Amino acid sequence: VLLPGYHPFEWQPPLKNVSSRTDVGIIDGLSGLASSVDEYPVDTIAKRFRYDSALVSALMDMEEDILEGMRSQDLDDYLNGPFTVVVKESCDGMGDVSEKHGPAVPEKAVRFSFTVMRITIEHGSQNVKVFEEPKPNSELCCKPLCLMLADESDHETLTAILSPLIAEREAMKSSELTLEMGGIPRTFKFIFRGTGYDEKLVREVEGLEASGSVYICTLCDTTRLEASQNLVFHSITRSHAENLQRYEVWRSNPYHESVEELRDRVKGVSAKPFIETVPSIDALHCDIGNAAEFYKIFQLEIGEVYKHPNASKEERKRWQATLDKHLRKRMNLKPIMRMNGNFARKLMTQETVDAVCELIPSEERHEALRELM
């Protein structure tokens, strides 16, 4: 009952290039990938669900929460008006998976998942929130859709395994699901949002360059230099369409340009994207970046670099030793050799600014630091 392939359902209109059979369970993740000795060598084992079928199984699983959520919003159990499902899509490598008795042969894995984020119902010109995932980053609600033993950096296999999933996902973007819940047929409209991709996988599936590139942002076309001089005024200009377009520009070279000029033109989109993603940022990295900058500012303000341009390695090392000792003394803050989250959390406080001001000569710089913090 709890596995994909148990309940019946219908898509209106029927999904493009997706079977209408509802009794499909676990399917081979290669999706009929050729395996003869002549073909490309297939070195991976993978299994997956059919994306629509998995969406049905997940919905039936949360049926009781949907009915209870409609009740808690003063709506009717038997109401069937169109529900909307915001599905968060994810994909990550799982590093090493090997079991070993030394001569450790690594074995990497890729997990392709989805997370029902919220379900709403149109009751008026209003969208009533009948379900919202309480712990959206938990492993409890991250429904596995495809498991594969392959390297996330192995583009040929990544695209061969994932392309059928993406195709079913696309097909569902243009249809409505009818499914029987508590005796009443209901209809569901889906909104897939690929936010579960860390930067490396974003860049890989959206055609961008590797993280060391000058084009540092996956939301805009800024270079590292541009982003350092222009600090605040950028806008979210990249998109899956633009990126498809830029790959085509890169491929056809329509204005017969040199590689540097062509690369400048296409803003680093030098391979064909194959997954539409929605790159974001986590609350953690905002704090981390700010704290790294404030830490460096603390060390330099202890050394009065505003007043002295040059300083040897020894002078800066003694500045950092002073700051670390003083934070350990007055703020009870252990020194760390590596950036991390809770050092940031504990260091980004006005109390720490008073502490570090105890080590700064001029108080105009006290004012500056207090206002920056």
Partner DNA sequence: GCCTGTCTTA
In this complex, which beta carbon is closest to DNA, that of residue 159 or of residue 223? 223
Is residue 198 marked as binding?
A: yes
The three state secondary structure string of 65-115 is: HHHHHHHHCCCCCCCCCCEEEEEEEEEEEEEECCCCCCCCCCCEEEEEEEE
The entry of DNA, other proteins, Mn ion, none near residue 301 (CB within 5 to 8 angstroms by kind) is none
Q: Residues 6 or more apart from 55 whose CB is under 8 A from it?
A: 85, 87, 114, 172, 177, 190
Q: How far is the CB of 340 from DNA (least distance, A)?
A: 7
The entry of other proteins, Mn ion, Zn ion, none near residue 234 (CB within 5 to 8 angstroms by kind) is Zn ion
- Diameter of the chain by CA atoms? 78
Q: How many helices (H) and strands (E) does the chain have?
A: 12, 9
Residue type for position 216: I
In this complex, which beta carbon is closest to other proteins, that of residue 128 or of residue 262? 262
Cβ atoms of residues 88 and 141 within 8 Å: no
Q: How far is the CB of 266 from other proteins (least distance, A)?
A: 10
Q: How far is the CB of 154 from other proteins (least distance, A)?
A: 8
Cβ atoms of residues 6 and 56 within 8 Å: no
Nearest Cα to Cα of residue 289 among 216, 363, 365: 216
Nearest Cα to Cα of residue 331 among 308, 311, 356: 356
Given candidates 139, 212, 229, 231, which one binds DNA under the rule CB under 7 A? 212
In this complex, which beta carbon is closest to Zn ion, that of residue 280 or of residue 349? 280
Q: Residues 6 or more apart from 84 whose CB is under 8 A from it?
A: 119, 120, 121, 122, 127, 188, 189, 190, 191
The entry of DNA, other proteins, Mn ion, none near residue 34 (CB within 5 to 8 angstroms by kind) is other proteins
What is the signed CA dihedral for 351, 355, 361, 363, rounded to 10 degrees? 10
Kindly report the number of other CB atoms within 10 A of residue 328's CB atom. Answer: 12
The entry of DNA, other proteins, Mn ion, none near residue 33 (CB within 5 to 8 angstroms by kind) is other proteins
Is residue 92 marked as binding?
A: yes
The entry of other proteins, Mn ion, DNA, none near residue 198 (CB within 5 to 8 angstroms by kind) is Mn ion
Interacting positions 172-211 with Mn ion (CB under 5 A): 198
The entry of other proteins, Zn ion, Mn ion, none near residue 92 (CB within 5 to 8 angstroms by kind) is Mn ion
d(CA 180, CA 259): 57
Given candidates 92, 170, 209, 257, which one binds Mn ion under the rule CB under 5 A? 92
Given candidates 7, 189, 234, 265, which one binds Zn ion under the rule CB under 5 A? 234
Interacting positions 173-232 with Zn ion (CB under 5 A): 217, 219-220
Binding site for Mn ion (CB under 5 A): 92-93, 198
Tell me the binding residues. 92, 198
Tell me the binding residues for a divalent metal cation. 92, 198
Binding site for DNA (CB under 7 A): 210, 212, 336-338
